[PDB]
């Protein structure tokens, strides 16, 4: 059974777990001690240290995304993550960038910091999610037909939307309902249903991070 | 003492002696060498009264492998006399392979004495024909700054280096020259592709009273300004403010050169203004010293392309052809330098050595055995083989040449000559694709200096421990030392090979080293080459050099511009 | 025709140029000013506004490995850059993230900054390349037992490698020589020996933009 090192609150981790349960395939999870990194985390990644990471047929695999997209190529059987064509899986990945900088950017202002970081920051937020909302255009999910590789991509910072309405004091549902209830719909299934954690944990947890590091 | 009529008059009585003269060549050179091993073998003893004859049923013909071995056994720490004789003061390589292996040929003071007659000689018939000012100037691309030593202690050498570093060369051709415009250093310049800009610039910097402009081809001119085209705004800037450009850095020519620098503005407004004004450089030649009478180089056979991109540079001025001869012994003067390239022929000088030809007459090739020289045949084309004191007696060099007349008895050469071709399998490669390859390779860390690489070569160095590959470029630029490190291990990692990967990776074959050397050494190579004495099938230039070949190797060391050895492995 | 937006000195519109010409695509290289991004650039991408932007059944394609497995995908008979597992592939994207993240910042650190900021990317680089030779190790590649993927992504830093060693006032090739090495290496593909510009320029552009910077 794959192994995945993981931490619990990770938005990105969640992806690798919500791949993994989105297939069918079972796996191992583990939690590690950034404090304290297992010997097979330090074995597979001695450069980054870094989750997620997944051993399958005793290679390594590290990076959420990278994790995604070794999920749909090692499984191409049943649930396909991609579409057929060249230049969907490529708006996709264009999509999948989008998240993973500017508004994992934007949001790391968001439950992160304060003051005029959190502001522009907030400013940031709900552009991005206004600009995820416009592509959208308005379809349910993201990466195909049904559940896909973006819609993955994304759908682990629904488990931290609050936490962004906590900080950040806004409502990204008022001001776009349609991404936090994109998520709500995901939230359906089991690979949302049992690997995203309480987002209270997750609130919790964000403001407890805000109190150990000024 | 050079003079005009005695020496013509002489050079006259002498041709019109070929037969005496060639014949005393023959026991001059015997007289000289009655105790050759090689001869030994064949059963001479010199005098007798059917000497020649004896010699030409007794002894016979050789091929490069075969003096291999001998010429090596000279070089390599057996200090010892064998083909010739004397340990020679220096040793030369030859072009198309032997068996796609180096070739040795013996380097003595002979070879210098021929050197100047044929010039004082030569440059007396020419200006003859183009008569000089005893007070002027040449612009002279010619170089010999590179001197190696062979691994027995011995010199090995070019012809170039051998007579321009020969302790008789400044003394003997102060005469029969139009002196220099370089400092001998500079010629002798660490650096040759930085003293040829030097040399442009030298040329280039008393162009009133020169005379004529030279090179030994025509390709070596054109090479010459078709750099020119790329850097006179440089040379402007450089010659102008009396400082010169950073992209000189040996500090021997560099300090020369400051001794040469004050800051002078107003020129550049002259050359800046004419050089803009002509139509894609033609005629160049005339326009840089305008009464130069001629442009001097070998004209005829694989040179041919080269005559008319430098016609066009040459515009209206006359090419007059270079004689024709090497290392290997000297074979014929051009007496009629007015003659143009494609008519140009050249007409063998008779004590230069003791010469036969075999006829390719009957279909190709033809049983027929080696007849004389004055008994060689009109219009007819025949193999040159050669006996002189360059280690060759009734060596086949692999030529073919044509006879178009004699001027009095002494006949008259042409050359539509180009390779010595057929070739055989190796050891110096890594085969001709994997190092061709190889530079190809490395070459283009260069290419990012909107450079190319012009041409290069190779070496087994096996004094040392472990022995360790030498790799020579020429490229058209200064640069620096970062990227052509890179490219050595470029070299290295082009010997795609599993074999190299074994030793270099374990380390029993030391780390190849990259010597990059300077503009002009494969020009070196060629101009020496195709001038060199059979017939123009001379220009397929060995790749990589094995103990036994040496014209490249004098040229192999002193102008490292840089060498290293992989700080990689 | 394939349309690409391009800038001579990006190591991006490299990616792009290297990965369309290794393939086999004949296509046309438009120049920009990005003081004047184009019309048909500023439709491409009107936010990012940056290259490359390869443009195709006039779909326009953009970042610069997004581009390059568009490239793949776009024509998928006959220059594969991937092998055929999914782990291969995953390595190799693996790896791809790796020269777009502390590789390039580092980089851009030794050309683009100076003092305090140099020296910290000074370490960083040489740290890279190493990391980079030790998992070079010996392949004459990277992404398959050919040219790569990630050949692609990295080769096209190695014209740049001349304004490093200058203004680091370094020379990357004792501490890491087998990376350059393989750099000229790639270089003799004409899908690299034909995209590159100069790198006396290219040094030229980083000794511009530092001449404004001081
Ligand atoms: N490219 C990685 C980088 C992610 C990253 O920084 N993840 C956090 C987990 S929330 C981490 O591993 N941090 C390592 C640390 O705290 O030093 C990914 O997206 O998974
Ligand atoms: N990872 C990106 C990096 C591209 C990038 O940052 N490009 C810069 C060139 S430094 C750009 O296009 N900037 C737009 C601008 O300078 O206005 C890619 O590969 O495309
Ligand atoms: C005897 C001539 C020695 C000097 C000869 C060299 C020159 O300076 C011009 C080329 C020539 C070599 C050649 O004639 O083969
Ligand atoms: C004898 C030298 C002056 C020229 C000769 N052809 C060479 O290049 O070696």
Redesign the interface.
Known sequence: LPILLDYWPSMFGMRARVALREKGVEFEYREEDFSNKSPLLLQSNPIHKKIPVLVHNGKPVCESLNVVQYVDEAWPEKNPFFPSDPYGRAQARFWADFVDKKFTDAQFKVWGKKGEEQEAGKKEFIEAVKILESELGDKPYFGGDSFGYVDISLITFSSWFQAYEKFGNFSIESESPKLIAWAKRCMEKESVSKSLPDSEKIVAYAAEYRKNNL | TFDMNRVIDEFDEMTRNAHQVQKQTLKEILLKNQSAIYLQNCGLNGNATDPEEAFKSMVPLVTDVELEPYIKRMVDGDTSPILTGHPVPAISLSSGTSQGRPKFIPFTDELMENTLQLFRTAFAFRNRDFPIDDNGKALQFIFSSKQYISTGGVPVGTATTNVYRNPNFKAGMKSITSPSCSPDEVIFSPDVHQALYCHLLSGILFRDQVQYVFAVFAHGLVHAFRTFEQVWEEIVTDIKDGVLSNRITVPSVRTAMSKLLTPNPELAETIRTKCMSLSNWYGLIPALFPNAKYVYGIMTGSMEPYVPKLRHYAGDLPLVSHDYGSSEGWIAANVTPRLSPEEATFAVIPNLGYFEFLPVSETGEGEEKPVGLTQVKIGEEYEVVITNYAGLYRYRLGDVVKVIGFYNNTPQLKFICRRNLILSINIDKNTERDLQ?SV??????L????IEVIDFSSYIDVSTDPGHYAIFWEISGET?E??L???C??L???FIDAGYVSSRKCKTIGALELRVVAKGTFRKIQEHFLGLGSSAGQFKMPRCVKPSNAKVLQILCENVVSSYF????
């Open positions: 390859l190809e390779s490395a070459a283009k860390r290419s990012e200096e909107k620096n970062d990227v490190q890179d490219c291990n470029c290295d990692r082009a992989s700080t990689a492995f």
